[PDB]
Design a protein around this ligand. Structure first.
Ligand SMILES: [Fe+3]
Ligand SMILES: [Fe+3]
Ligand SMILES: [Fe+3]
Ligand SMILES: [Fe+3]
Lengths: 511, 132, 388, 166, 511, 55, 55, 132, 55
């Protein structure tokens, strides 16, 4: 007819004028506390508009589901996965879910504190992303409950969450450590540290362990989750470059970096390490090597190393590498001991695994291996025994404390990881600590950290009562969601926990 | 170059005490700068084709001899000295269909380095954008 | 040919054999229902609900919370992560809300993608067909570039007003809703600029620079009270509920509805313009999508709370009344546009009827639901007083 | 009964909040409770397990009473004690920028929260406070963070050292 | 605001007035010859509308291409497939492709011969269906060519198929047997016997054998292909009811039915059965059982048996069942004998196979088995031998003929199926037929069956030049696409075929 | 086409709830589209069937 | 729509050359008549009656 | 009814000359009328769910006790006496998302018998519609 | 839980091993392009041109 065929307005022809959408008025300022107040007029690296963002993600979902729904369900990829790993994913998925859910709120602060229009469009797009990843992790549990071998814990993870101390930390690593604090700082705690360092081993490297043990559900979802997390990094980086160019704002960088780095790796390191090695059968490699690749050599190398742009190598790295070698071993002792709390089944390290540990962690058998052997001898896998490893901790004078800061359970009489007990008394309340950094955080700011631990709340309570109040049973009302073994025979009932009489004590009462 | 960019480049590939002895002492308790880059490509039909027919054959051979591709379970782990740039119009041509960068980011799973777009070209570089 | 270096527990014989040997003969629980405990809004639990409800780790001291204990880390000073003190509205349960359209992320982006691609095919067809020849030049050079392009900032300011809400929202459902609402708004703004860019493409001389409509928004006589309202709703409210409510249940429902439906989509047809009503359709569709969620949240859940009904209603009349005046001022100020219209484009009688449409709609859908005693005649009159 | 979401502490405080029929008795009980059980500066830790829930169940009373007793302008601009929120806000921020160290600052901020926490002060003024107040407290705290030895820091906090493993 | 929110007006609400879209006028009549004049006031059994059609089909494409492009490329499901099946799918997919593609034009006749408006709508939807099915089959070849062990064949089965004898039959069964003839008869040839009897063993049954041999690409595509082929059946059956309700039209039915049945079974039964058993390592069940299931008992009893309407069992049925037992066994001999003509790699039956055939088709070893053994002894696989199984046919006086009608190759001296040589001459040209029905078809309609045969076209030609002209070679331009062994080493070349100097001769010339 | 079909659905559901029908001329409605636009339906329908032979 | 119906009846049922049908439909009849009815009548006058549905 | 509608009822389950005899003579050279129905459903999430929780449960017990489903490769071979009906609003409720017959028609691979949809209610029957 | 009664050459260890052992070292042809001989209207072949031409 009249002229040719242009729709010649792509996303990038509209995005060219997106920066001008913002006008100068008076109260055009952030509604949040922040000490970072340099000019932050940065450009969004992936020049997205709303509809083109939606299209891209729609393509991801398009291929993602259907693989789930058509082929993987045909291949029965939800059953031909493998029990320990089936139980492991309840924790991995649900905890990622809440971490990525808090990322939405953290982005809310990043969005609100943004000064460029491109980034406000970008950060709301990121909000949508973290909402997606939420629904994605939500979908993994959904699928594994619907098609898997043990749906219990996959189906009610969000309330059976509440019985165990590992959950308490998860509400701090990639969550309260993000949203509860400085707003512009979220460029560091959420993005320079969280999404630039720990998302990789936790979302990418887990898929390997998944695929090694028959899970092809997790790779399809998680490897699509991370696809979004790379644009996040680049936009956070731009806020970082703004900070480091203002002498009045760069001064806050190193401490906040270090405070963030420790905050996350304090829980990240022992919990993901123990989920990989103790929650699987086929190992991909030692967790330290995963930790040394992603965290130390690549993240630290290409990010922290490159910045120097006076940015310092974290002070707590020395302790972290040590935690990277031992913390995950220290923690499974606790987790397996406190097995009647979780929403998942746990298993003892078999013979081939003990050899694997000893071969890659020299000293493992003499310390950990013998303990598991004793526990096995006492009948921890047998409901007719009347034994839980917690009893062994008490018999042998081995107290278990919860860090007031990180919420990570620890046992200073057994720990080979970089943890050291500290007990204080303030205003008629005693506070326990497992490192110098956490104790420094509470010493300076004791009003941020008032989180009641499982011992303070369950003090004077009988174990089975707590498990039953929080619906830790299965559909019969008899059987527990948690088990000390992974077989489907001779499962522990409620009356088997009530058979023994484990009443909780607040360990600090000993002082 | 290509082999210093391997996943298991030393000290990875040391076992037991030989690994601990290097991981626990002593100049390795502080962070070391790296002019490299990491690119995680999610495994798919479009991406495998790209790696096999553009990355390993054209880009590696003609622009960046140092790019190392490793096979993990569900993804390709890629590392290189300097940067990696992907013109997506070549992927479009090679796939026999329409394809822009946002179609490409569908299977670009992760990055370690500062990444960005400009037109339909995808860049991931070691260079600190805004400080250098 | 080449099978590769790595092995899988699914394909690889040895590993699979190990895994299959370890498998049970039946599931260890006969309950394949995720969120089986979640009380469903409708007859049976939906994917929307199952994948969304209780995703926020709230404790029982926040209505509907299932967890216990205090937040693990808090603000400098002691301010909690999420708390009851971030809003004036109160509930029995914050997780009662439902998007009646049941949007979670996947269907949401699917729908928008469709709209995006069809927009592309449309613009290609419209340009190739040459329908630009049937449009009045004055309406295009002035009424589309300057006055329609200035509404961009209204939708932009309205979108940024959701920023704090994305952080302070007190549940998963509301958060999901809010984000979608604000995201629809920024989409509409960009789609306005999309149209200016397109016109700049098929009409030589047409400048797509935002300079002109920006100057009409910043230093304008028509949108001055509008911008004042926007600046206020955006950056002078700290109650995330007051923000969302006042923007959707008061300001956009009156001013936004009138500008889009009773001006630009009522008057563009008369200048040979099928271009901008194409996008306004997305806009109105978006509005009526959001409206449904806004209604379920504030009226069905909050104002019909079997415990905090009269409290919420009182506060929502407060906000309704607090923001009703910058909106009437915004409307009365917009009426100075009908005088730059070419003669006999529309008359006082039509303008009045359109005002009553917006107002009677706002009464039926919003004001009445919280028992707000609004007087249509005094509102329409207050606005018509600036009819030049 | 002695549970987590259901004990006798909560019942008693439910059956104790169900008598407060006036705003002044409600607002002060709330303010007092917040001085008793809320912060690290609290007067006791006997309700540590149940204080957040009962604070909320007292907030609900104060809010419903404040809205039922106030007009539209007062509810929007005034506390439950009758004070100009804009004045309390302006003053507290003036007091905060006059503070000399992290110690003076935290007492101001915490005090502001213990006293003027909604449904006492309107939400908007409060979070505007949190904005400026939290800004200053952070500015004063995170300076030379690691320069004060933990030994000296425990002194300044005024803690009673119970055990130190190495 | 307004009233409620109807988008209301779904498919079945516009469809209510579809039948009223046609208006009476003079030339409102078919452009194709037809002896069926009755009225097709037929209602499309699926109230389809163009946009709901596209929607439903888009959803299928979403999951299908998702699984293909995402998860199955991650499991390498294009490689982890038994080499025999990798070769078989070159024929199956490409032959089905042309079958479906011809079904487009066949439906174009049904669309033109239709009288109801709802069916003109439905038949353009059916036309579109066979267009999807065309592109789907092509896609299987497309995928296996780009991601498989031997793209040769898959990458040019549209010009290398022109060398073979099996391709000629294919251009009739589900091709010319549909589109060449009566338009209102296609309700019987294309639909009542084509889509309702044979697309189940040809699309649904194949998926089982595909999964058995490690292929999860074919089930993903093919099971999604057949999903449409039921609206076809119903919308064809509706025309059948029209015909059976008209005494002047019901007089042609049984003849057209039987003729279509035999026409199709003549090539479907042997070619597909031999494709299954001699093209797979892992067998699902004997072909006679598959055949007895879907054809004789199911389609026979469900459609044809129930119609007695006044429909009869096919007269050729007894001959058809005989072809079920032996004809496919008869055809692999010939097919393997003429292996250089193909575009795919064939293989001798190994020991298990050798005894699986005897276990299920007793008398197999004494007939087919010892021929295969002799052939291996002669060196049919070794490029140095100078042996091709066609030579054994010559030496032992077993002439190979091609039907003038069905185009199916047959050797009557060896045949155990229902093949019986009949030679006629007429105006200076001789004609070979293998059955009562086919030769009657020619005797009544000699102007339809004029298809030249392999020996006619290549008369006096040296095999190497035939292969070389039709591009039956690989990338090197030396090695043959087809091989007598499915292995990967010591492959035959042009020279290996030129060396033994095989010149084609017209068998009919010998009379 | 599926994209068009679903956005059409969303559009109508929006138009009908947004009450844009009120501003529309009643004469142009029950006469100029109900009768004269609804008759172009058959024009396109015949134009559709003019492809049955080319397939 | 008399001559229009006649042209349609012709194009549809009185042409056996598939190329003639398709060409004459899209390159002659629709490109003139159809384009006028759709664009230069309905989607040009409809907006003048408050109709955004038909366009 | 369930082993009678089994995929391997007589003369299946017979092999060798046990099969050939009953296959080649002589009442079996003629087609035998069947009151049954064959439904082929593609193996996916929705189909498995409808089969496991609707088809085998309430339908097989309350409506048609003769429905026999058997596992094959990537599909379910279902066979019943007379007819099978699928209410898709019932499925829609069970899935928690919008589902009609056309959403359900995505994974119904084949049919032996007459199929049709009455609104959102898909039914397949052995009755000859229009001549019975 | 329950993994059916039918086995696959992709999953089942016994069959998969058989298939694996039977595989070649490399593809028997490096020409992985379906429709490589098909003329391309533009410089490069497309799926449209591949899945369609010469069918
Ligand atoms: Fe995320
Ligand atoms: Fe992120
Ligand atoms: Fe087909
Ligand atoms: Fe078909």
């Amino acid at each position: 007819a009249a002229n040719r065929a242009p729709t010649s307005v792509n996303a990038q022809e509209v995005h060219r004028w997106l920066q001008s959408f913002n006008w100068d008025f008076k109260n055009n300022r952030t509604k949040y506390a922040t000490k970072y107040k340099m000019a932050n007029e940065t450009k969004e690296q992936f020049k997205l508009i709303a509809k083109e963002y939606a299209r891209m993600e729609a393509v991801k979902d398009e291929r993602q589901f259907g693989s789930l729904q058509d082929a993987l369900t045909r291949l029965n990829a939800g059953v031909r996965v493998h029990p320990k790993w089936n139980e492991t994913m309840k924790v991995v998925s649900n905890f990622l879910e809440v971490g990525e859910y808090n990322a939405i709120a953290a982005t809310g602060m990043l969005w609100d504190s943004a000064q460029a229009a491109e980034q406000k469009n970008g950060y709301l797009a990121q909000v949508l992303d973290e909402i997606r990843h939420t629904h994605q992790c939500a979908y993994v549990n959904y699928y594994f409950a619907k098609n898997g071998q043990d749906p219990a814990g996959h189906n009610d993870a969000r309330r059976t969450r509440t019985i165990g101390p590992l959950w308490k930390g998860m509400k701090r690593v990639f969550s309260d450590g993000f949203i509860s604090g400085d707003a512009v700082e979220c460029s560091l705690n959420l993005q320079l540290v969280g999404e630039a360092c720990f998302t990789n081993p936790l979302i990418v490297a887990v898929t390997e362990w998944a695929a090694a043990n028959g899970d092809e559900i997790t790779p399809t979802v998680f490897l699509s989750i991370e696809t979004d997390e790379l644009r996040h990094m680049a936009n956070g980086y731009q806020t970082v470059v703004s900070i480091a160019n203002d002498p009045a704002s760069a001064k806050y960088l190193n401490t906040d970096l270090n405070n963030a780095f420790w905050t996350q790796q304090k829980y990240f390191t022992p919990v993901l390490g123990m989920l990989f090695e103790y929650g699987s059968k086929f190992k991909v490699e030692p967790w330290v090597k995963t930790w040394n690749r992603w965290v130390y050599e690549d993240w630290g190398g290409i990010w922290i190393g490159r910045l120097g742009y006076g940015v310092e190598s974290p002070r707590s790295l020395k302790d972290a590498k040590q935690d990277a070698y031992w913390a995950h071993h220290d923690l499974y002792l606790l987790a397996y001991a406190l097995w009647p709390t979780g929403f998942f089944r746990l298993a003892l390290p078999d013979q081939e695994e003990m050899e694997w540990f000893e071969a890659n962690y020299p000293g493992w058998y003499d310390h950990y291996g013998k303990i598991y052997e004793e526990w096995r001898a006492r009948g921890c896998e047998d409901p007719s025994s009347g034994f839980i490893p917690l009893m062994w901790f008490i018999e042998n004078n081995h107290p278990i404390y919860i860090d007031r800061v990180s919420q990570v359970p620890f046992c200073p009489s057994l720990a080979k990881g970089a943890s050291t007990l500290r007990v204080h008394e303030y205003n008629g309340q005693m506070h326990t600590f497992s490192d110098q950094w956490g104790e420094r955080m509470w010493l300076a700011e004791p009003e941020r950290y008032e989180c009641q631990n499982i011992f303070e709340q369950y003090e004077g309570r009988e174990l089975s009562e707590v498990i039953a109040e929080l619906h830790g049973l299965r559909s019969d009302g008899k059987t527990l969601i948690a088990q000390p073994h992974v077989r489907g025979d001779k499962l522990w009932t409620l009356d088997d926990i009530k058979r023994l009489n484990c009443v909780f004590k607040n360990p600090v009462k000993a002082f | 170059s290509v082999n210093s960019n391997a996943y298991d480049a030393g000290i990875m590939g040391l076992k037991g005490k030989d690994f601990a002895d290097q991981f626990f002492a002593d100049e390795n308790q502080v962070v070391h700068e790296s002019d490299t880059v990491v690119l995680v490509l999610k495994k798919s039909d479009e991406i495998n084709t790209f790696i096999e027919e553009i990355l390993l054959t054209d880009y590696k051979k003609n622009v960046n001899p140092t790019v190392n591709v490793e096979d993990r379970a569900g993804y390709w782990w890629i590392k290189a000295n300097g940067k990696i740039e992907v013109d997506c119009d070549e992927i479009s041509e090679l796939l026999g269909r329409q394809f822009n960068v946002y179609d490409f980011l569908v299977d670009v799973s992760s990055t370690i380095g500062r990444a960005y777009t400009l037109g339909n070209k995808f860049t991931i570089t070691s260079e600190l954008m805004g400080l250098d | 040919s080449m099978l590769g270096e790595r092995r899988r527990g699914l394909t690889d014989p040895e590993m699979a054999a190990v895994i299959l040997k370890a498998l049970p003969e039946a599931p260890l629980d006969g309950n394949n229902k995720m969120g089986y405990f979640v009380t469903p809004r409708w007859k049976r639990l939906t994917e929307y609900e199952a994948l969304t409800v209780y995703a926020q780790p709230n404790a029982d001291w926040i209505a509907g919370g299932l967890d216990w204990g205090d937040w693990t880390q808090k603000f400098h000073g002691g301010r909690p992560s999420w708390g009851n003190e971030t809003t004036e509205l109160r509930t029995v349960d914050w997780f009662k809300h439902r998007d009646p359209l049941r949007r979670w992320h996947a269907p949401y982006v699917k729908d928008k993608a469709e709209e995006w691609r069809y927009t592309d095919r449309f613009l290609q067809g419209y340009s190739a067909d040459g329908q630009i020849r049937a449009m009045n030049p004055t309406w295009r050079d002035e009424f589309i570039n300057r006055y329609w392009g200035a509404f961009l900032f209204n939708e932009y300011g309205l979108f940024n007003a959701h920023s704090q809400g994305a952080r302070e929202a007190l549940s998963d459902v509301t958060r999901v809703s809010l984000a979608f609402w604000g995201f629809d708004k920024i989409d509409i703004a960009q789609m306005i600029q999309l149209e200016r860019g397109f016109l700049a493409k098929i009409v030589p001389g047409f400048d797509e620079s935002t300079a002109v409509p920006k100057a009409e928004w910043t230093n304008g006589e028509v949108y001055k009270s509008a911008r004042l309202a926007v600046e206020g709703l955006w950056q002078e409210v700290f109650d995330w509920n007051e923000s969302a409510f006042s923007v959707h249940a008061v300001y956009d429902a009156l001013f936004g509805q009138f500008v889009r439906r009773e001006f630009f989509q009522r008057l563009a047809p008369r200048f040979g313009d099928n271009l901008t009503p194409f996008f306004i359709n997305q806009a109105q569709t978006y509005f009526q999508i959001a409206k449904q969620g806004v209604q379920d949240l504030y009226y069905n859940c909050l104002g019909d709370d079997p415990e905090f009904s009269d409290y919420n209603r009182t506060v929502m009349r407060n906000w309704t009344g607090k923001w009703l005046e910058p909106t009437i001022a915004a409307l009365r100020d917009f009426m100075g546009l009908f005088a730059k219209l070419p003669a006999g484009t529309t008359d006082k009688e039509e303008i009045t009827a359109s005002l009553y449409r917006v107002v009677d709609d706002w009464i039926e859908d919003y004001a009445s639901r919280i028992d707000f005693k609004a007087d249509r005649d005094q509102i329409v009159k207050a606005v018509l007083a600036g009819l030049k | 009964k002695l549970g987590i979401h259901s004990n006798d502490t909560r019942d008693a405080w439910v059956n104790k909040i169900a008598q407060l029929n006036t705003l002044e008795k409600a607002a002060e009980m709330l303010k007092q409770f917040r001085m008793d059980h809320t912060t690290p500066f609290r007067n006791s830790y006997e309700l540590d397990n149940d204080y957040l829930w009962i604070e909320a169940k007292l907030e609900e009373k104060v809010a419903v009473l404040k809205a039922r007793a106030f007009n539209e302008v007062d509810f929007r601009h005034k506390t439950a004690f009758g004070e100009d929120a804009k004045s309390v806000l302006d003053g507290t921020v003036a007091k905060m920028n006059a503070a000399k160290d992290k110690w003076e600052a935290e007492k101001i901020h915490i005090g502001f929260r213990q006293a003027y926490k909604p449904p006492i002060m309107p939400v908007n003024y409060f979070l505007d406070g949190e904005r400026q107040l939290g800004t200053r407290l952070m500015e004063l705290r995170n300076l030379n963070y690691y320069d004060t030895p933990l030994e000296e820091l425990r002194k300044q906090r005024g803690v009673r050292v119970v055990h130190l493993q190495s």
